[PDB]
Amino acid sequence: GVEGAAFQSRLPHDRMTSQEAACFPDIISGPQQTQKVFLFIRNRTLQLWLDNPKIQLTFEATLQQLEAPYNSDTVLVHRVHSYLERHGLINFGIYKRIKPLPTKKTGKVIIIGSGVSGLAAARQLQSFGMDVTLLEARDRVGGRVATFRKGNYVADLGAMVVTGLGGNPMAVVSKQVNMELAKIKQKCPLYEANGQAVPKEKDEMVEQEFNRLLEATSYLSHQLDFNVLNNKPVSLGQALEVVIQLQEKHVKDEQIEHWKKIVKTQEELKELLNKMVNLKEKIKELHQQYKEASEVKPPRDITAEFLVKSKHRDLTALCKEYDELAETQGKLEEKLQELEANPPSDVYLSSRDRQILDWHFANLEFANATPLSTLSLKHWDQDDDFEFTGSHLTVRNGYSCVPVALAEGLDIKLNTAVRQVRYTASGCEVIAVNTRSTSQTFIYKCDAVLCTLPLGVLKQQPPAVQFVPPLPEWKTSAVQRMGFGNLNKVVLCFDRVFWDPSVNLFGHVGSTTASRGELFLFWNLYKAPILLALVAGEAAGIMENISDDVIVGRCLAILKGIFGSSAVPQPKETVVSRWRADPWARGSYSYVAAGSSGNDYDLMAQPITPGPSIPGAPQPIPRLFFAGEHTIRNYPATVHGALLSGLREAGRIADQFLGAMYTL
Amino acid sequence: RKPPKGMFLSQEDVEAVSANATAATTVLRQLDMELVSVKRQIQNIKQTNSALKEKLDGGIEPYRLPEVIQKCNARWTTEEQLLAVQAIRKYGRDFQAISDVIGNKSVVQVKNFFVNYRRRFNIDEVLQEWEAE
Numbered sequence: 085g086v087e088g089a090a091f092q093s094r095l096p097h098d099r100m101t102s103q104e105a106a107c108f109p110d111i112i113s114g115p116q117q118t119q120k121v122f123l124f125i126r127n128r129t130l131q132l133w134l135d136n137p138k139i140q141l142t143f144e145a146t147l148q149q150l151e152a153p154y155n156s157d158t159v160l161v162h163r164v165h166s167y168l169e170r171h172g173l174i175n176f177g178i179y180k181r182i183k184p185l186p187t188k189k190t191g192k193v194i195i196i197g198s199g200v201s202g203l204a205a206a207r208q209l210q211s212f213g214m215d216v217t218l219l220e221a222r223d224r225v226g227g228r229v230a231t232f233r234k235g236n237y238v239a240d241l242g243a244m245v246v247t248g249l250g251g252n253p254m255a256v257v258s259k260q261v262n263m264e265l266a267k268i269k270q271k272c273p274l275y276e277a278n279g280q281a282v283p284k285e286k287d288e289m290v291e292q293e294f295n296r297l298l299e300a301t302s303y304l305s306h307q308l309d310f311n312v313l314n315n316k317p318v319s320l321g322q323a324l325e326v327v328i329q330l331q332e333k334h335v336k337d338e339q340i341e342h343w344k345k346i347v348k349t350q351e352e353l354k355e356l357l358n359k360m361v362n363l364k365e366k367i368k369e370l371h372q373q374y375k376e377a378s379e380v381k382p383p384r385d386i387t388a389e390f391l392v393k394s395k396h397r398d399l400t401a402l403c404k405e406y407d408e409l410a411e412t413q414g415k416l417e418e419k420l421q422e423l424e425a426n427p428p429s430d431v432y433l434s435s436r437d438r439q440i441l442d443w444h445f446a447n448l449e450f451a452n453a454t455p456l457s458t459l460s461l462k463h464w465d466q467d468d469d470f471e472f473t474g475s476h477l478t479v480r481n482g483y484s485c486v487p488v489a490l491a492e493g494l495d496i497k498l499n500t501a502v503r504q505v506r507y508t509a510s511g512c513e514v515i516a517v518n519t520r521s522t523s524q525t526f527i528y529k530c531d532a533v534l535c536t537l538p539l540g541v542l543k544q545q546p547p548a549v550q551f552v553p554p555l556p557e558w559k560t561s562a563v564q565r566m567g568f569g570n571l572n573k574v575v576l577c578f579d580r581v582f583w584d585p586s587v588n589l590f591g592h593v594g595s596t597t598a599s600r601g602e603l604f605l606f607w608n609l610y611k612a613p614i615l616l617a618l619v620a621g622e623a624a625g626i627m628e629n630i631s632d633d634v635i636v637g638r639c640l641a642i643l644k645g646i647f648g649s650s651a652v653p654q655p656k657e658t659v660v661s662r663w664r665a666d667p668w669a670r671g672s673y674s675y676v677a678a679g680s681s682g683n684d685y686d687l688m689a690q691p692i693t694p695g696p697s698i699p700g701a702p703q704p705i706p707r708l709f710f711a712g713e714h715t716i717r718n719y720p721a722t723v724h725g726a727l728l729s730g731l732r733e734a735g736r737i738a739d740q741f742l743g744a745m746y747t748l
Numbered sequence: 749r750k751p752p753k754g755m756f757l758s759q760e761d762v763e764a765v766s767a768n769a770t771a772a773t774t775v776l777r778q779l780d781m782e783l784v785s786v787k788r789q790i791q792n793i794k795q796t797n798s799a800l801k802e803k804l805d806g807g808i809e810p811y812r813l814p815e816v817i818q819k820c821n822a823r824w825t826t827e828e829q830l831l832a833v834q835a836i837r838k839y840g841r842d843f844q845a846i847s848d849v850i851g852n853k854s855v856v857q858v859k860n861f862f863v864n865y866r867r868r869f870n871i872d873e874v875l876q877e878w879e880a881e
C-alpha cells in the first residue's frame with residue numbers, strides 16, 4: 085500500500101524515526117492524531133516518488149495527488165516534502181529535473197573520490213544548487229565498482245550482486261538506469277579435490293553441521309558471555325575452534341561412558357561365573373556323596389536312609405541355585421551383545437568431512453572478506469538484521485553502468501590524486517597532483533570537503549593523504565580498530581561454455597584448511613562464456629604475490645578435474661584482481677574486526693569541525709565530512725550502503741550550508 | 749536460551765578447553781588415552797570370562813537328579829517320624845527342606861508336627877543342639 089513505500093524506504097510505517105523527531109519535534113511531542121497525519125503524508129509522498137522515480141516529484145505535484153483531510157495543512161506537506169527531498173528519500177538518483185536547475189550556485193564543496201558514495205553526494209549537492217567538484221585518483225569513476233570489458237566479454241571485478249530489492253535503494257536506481265538484473269539460483273554443487281561431486285547425503289550433512297556450529301558460537305557468545313579471553317576480544321574463528329573442540333570432546337565422553345557400561349556388566353558377569361564355577365564344583369562332589377550313600381544297599385537303618393534322602397534334597401537345592409544363575413547368565417549375556425552392537429559415534433567429523441566444512445568456512449570468509457580469525461565474535465553479524473527481502477541478483481551488463489550513469493553532468497577531475505587535506509575555520513584547501521606526471525600540483529579551495537576515501541586508504545601508514553590539522557584521536561582510533569578486508573576475483577573468458585549453464589555457481593573443496601579459499605567458488609553469470617573464480621580468506625592476500633598465469637593454471641587444473649581434461653580449452657582472455665595491492669583501495673570492503681563494534685562505523689561518519697583561527701572566536705562550522713561504505717553502521721561493505729552514506733552527507737552538508745528551513 | 753539440539757557445550761567445559769594454549773589438545777588426549785585403557789580392560793574380562801566359561805562345559809546335566817511324584821499322605825509312619833527328627837537336627841526350621849526330605853509330607857503337617865510331638869520328641873532340645881552351629 086502506502087505502507088509498502090515506508091518499508092521500501094527502510095522506514096517504520098507506523099512510528100516516527102529519530103531522524104524525523106529532529107526535524108519535526110513539534111509533531112512527535114504533539115497529539116497522537118497529528119502524528120498519524122504526518123506519517124501518512126510521509127508514506128504517501130514516499131509512495132508517489134517510488135511509483136515513478138524517473139521524474140522529479142515536485143511539492144506542487146505531491147499536494148495535488150494528496151487528498152483531504154491531509155492536504156488541508158499545506159505547510160506540513162511542504163515540510164514533509166522538503167525533509168524527504170533533503171535526505172534523498174525522494175528525488176535521488178537519476179531523475180528528470182522538472183524545474184531546470186538554477187545556475188545561482190551557493191557554496192563550493194570538494195568531494196574526494198568518484199565512488200558511489202561520492203557520486204551520490206555530488207548529484208544531490210548539485211541537485212541542491214551547490215558547486216561540487218569530485219577529485220579522483222583513477223582514470224575512471226566507480227572506485228570498487230569496476231567492470232571489465234573487452235569485446236563481447238563483460239565481468240565486474242568489484243561488486244556484482246544486488247542483495248534483494250526488498251527495501252533496497254538500488255531498486256530505484258535499476259529503474260532509472262537500465263540495469264539488466266538476473267537472479268542467482270541458490271543451488272551450488274560442491275566438487276572435491278579429486279574432482280568428484282560431494283554426495284548429496286554428505287553435502288546436506290556438513291552444511292547442516294555448519295549452521296549448527298554457527299548457532300553454537302552465538303549461544304556461546306550471548307548466553308555464556310565468552311567474549312574476552314586473556315585480555316583480548318574473542319573472534320568468531322576462536323569461538324568456532326572452541327565449539328568444534330567441545331564437540332570432539334563430547335564424542336569421546338560418549339565412547340568413554342559407553343564402554344564403562346560394557347565393562348561394568350562384564351565385571352558383574354565375571355563374578356556370576358565365579359559363583360557358577362564354585363557351585364558347580366560343590367554340586368560335583370555332593371553328587372559323589374549322594375551316590376556313595378545310595379550304593380549302601382538296603383535294608384538300612386534310618387540314619388543311613390536319612391542320609392540318602394537329605395543328600396538328595398541338598399543336591400537338588402544346589403541344582404536350583406545354579407539353575408537360577410544361568411537364568412541370570414542369559415539375562416546379561418545378550419546385554420553385552422546389545423551394547424556392543426549399539427556403539428555411539430566413532431568420530432565428530434572425518435578428514436574428508438572437515439574439508440567440506442572448510443568450504444562453508446571459505447564461503448563465510450568471502451562474505452565478510454576476511455579470515456574468520458579476525459571477525460568480532462560479538463558483532464560480526466550486526467548488519468545481518470537489516471537484510472533486504474527478495475533474492476540476490478547480478479548485473480548482466482556490468483555494474484559499471486550505475487556509476488557512469490550517475491557521473492552524468494558532474495565535474496569530475498580524473499587522474500587527480502588528493503594528497504593533503506587542509507581545513508580551517510574559514511574554509512578548506514585540497515592539494516592534488518596529476519597521477520600521470522606527479523609534477524603538476526593543484527590547489528582546490530572550498531567551503532567543505534566530503535571524504536569518500538576507502539578505509540584502507542585512511543589506514544595506510546605512512547599516510548597517503550595528510551590531514552592538516554591531523555584527524556583527532558577519536559577518529560584515527562576508529563580507523564585502527566575497524567577491519568578492512570580483502571577478497572580477490574579471477575575472470576576466465578572462453579570461446580565455449582562447457583559448464584552446466586543452469587548452474588549459476590559451483591564450488592571446489594580445497595585440500596587443506598590453510599588454503600580453503602584458493603579459488604573455492606565459480607560463477608556463471610553472463611551471456612558470454614565467462615566463469616568467475618573467488619579467492620577468499622587467508623588465500624586472498626597470499627595470491628596477490630603470484631603470477632597470473634600460475635593463478636589461471638591452478639584454475640584450469642581444477643576445472644579440468646571437475647569436467648575432464650578435454651572439455652576445458654585455454655581461456656581467450658583473463659584478468660585477476662589485486663585489491664589489497666591497489667593503492668586507491670588497499671582492500672575490498674570493511675568488516676567488523678574483533679575489538680571493533682558498530683559504534684566505530686558511526687564514529688567514522690561524525691564530521692570534523694576545526695578550531696577557531698583567532699582564539700576567543702565563536703565555535704566554527706564543521707568542514708570535513710565522511711561518506712563511503714565504512715561510514716554506514718546499518719549497511720556496511722555494500723554498494724547500497726555507500727550510496728546511502730553519500731545521500732546522507734549531501735543532506736548533512738546542505739542543511740549546514742544552505743540552511744534547513746523545514747524545522748518551523 | 750539453550751544450545752542447538754545435538755551441540756553440547758557447558759560453562760564448565762569451555763573454560764577447561766580455554767585455560768591454556770594447548771589445553772584443548774591436552775584434555776582430548778586424556779580421554780583418548782583413557783578410552784584405550786578402558787578398552788584394554790574389556791579384553792581382559794573377555795579373556796577371563798572366556799576361561800570361566802570352559803570350566804562350565806557340560807553344565808550339570810550329568811550331576812542332575814530325576815524328580816519323583818509324591819502324593820502328600822497325612823499318616824505318620826514310624827520311619828518318617830524318624831526322618832523328621834533327623835531333618836530337624838540337620839536343618840532346624842527350614843520347614844520346606846524338611847518337607848522335601850520326608851517327601852510325602854507338606855509344610856503344614858510338617859509345621860504342626862513340631863507341636864504334636866514337641867514333648868514326645870524333645871524338639872526344643874533337638875533345636876537347641878541345632879542352634880550350636
Ligand SMILES: Cc1cc2c(cc1C)N(C(=O)CCc1ccc(-c3ccccc3)cc1)c1c([nH]c(=O)[nH]c1=O)N2C[C@H](O)[C@H](O)[C@H](O)COP(=O)(O)OP(=O)(O)OC[C@H]1O[C@@H](n2cnc3c(N)ncnc32)[C@H](O)[C@@H]1O
Nearest residue numbers: 197199201221227228242243244245502668713722723726
Ligand atoms: C571490492 C569489492 C567490493 C564489493 C564486492 C566485491 C568486491 C571485490 N561485492 C561482492 O562481490 C560481495 C560483497 C557483499 C555482498 C553482500 C553483502 C551482504 C551483507 C549483509 C546482508 C546482505 C548482503 C555484503 C558484501 C559487492 C559489494 N557491494 C555490493 O553491494 N554488492 C557486492 O556484490 N562490494 C562493496 C562495494 O564495492 C563497496 O562498498 C563500494 O563500491 C564502495 O563505494 P564507496 O566506498 O562509496 O566509494 P569507493 O570507495 O567505491 O570509491 C573510492 C574512490 O576514491 C578514490 N580514491 C582513493 N584514494 C584517493 C586519493 N588519494 N585521491 C583521490 N581519489 C582517491 C578511488 O580511486 C575511488 O575513485
